[PDB]
Chains A and B, each alone.
Chain A
């Protein structure tokens, strides 16, 4: 499992 970048959840 890879961790998402700090902004991966931003539109």
Chain B
């Protein structure tokens, strides 16, 4: 299938800003390229069709350009309702394909996350399982990396994370990472730690507890 590469994948901007998103096709698709805007919990909305035509009813601040393999979408003046995800789509070849999308969030000063860790509850341990939670509070930008180390052993495949929507007040994000092991496995180890990497952190931060030291 024809491949579309959108860039950047993520972008931070402020109201009144001017942003430009590009979409590169693995090969020429003439002018058969469309741009859409998608707000959280809503369907895509058409902005530009046939590479540069402005869809009727769409604000003049939106414009598109390109033909062949390179395309750009430009928003002259960023509006509050414009912080969302944008996608390109080519309709020159079957199957019609979409780009990976570009999320646009409200930018602010960098803010390292406050990292908190929660060992499992006696309640859960009694049920047979042990979940350890690592919390990264109010940080920015959104990119962040969390790694679980149990007695220096990197944990993979046994942890899941969740991230909140950008805060409507301080424009920060919060992330929760849960590492789940069986009671038996949990009791065979001492040190439980989550390592965190973020732009606001001069160096990786480690938060942990030693259940073998009481």
Contacts and interface: CB of A to CB of B under 8 A. Distances in A.
Interface of A: 2-5, 8
Contact of A2 (B30, B91, B94): B94
Nearest to A3: B94
B2 interface: yes
Contacts of B150: none
Given A3-B94, A8-B32, 5 more contacts: A4-B93, A5-B91, A5-B92, A5-B96, A8-B30
Nearest to B26: A2
10 contacts: A2-B2, A2-B94, A3-B93, A4-B94, A5-B32, A5-B94, A5-B96, A8-B32, A8-B92, A8-B93
Nearest to B27: A2
Majority DSSP secondary structure for residues of A touching B? loop
Contacts, number: 19
Interface of B: 1-2, 30, 32, 91-94, 96
A4 B2 CA distance: 11
A5 B31 CA distance: 12
Nearest to B1: A2
B49 to A, nearest CB: 12
Nearest to A2: B93
Nearest to B96: A5
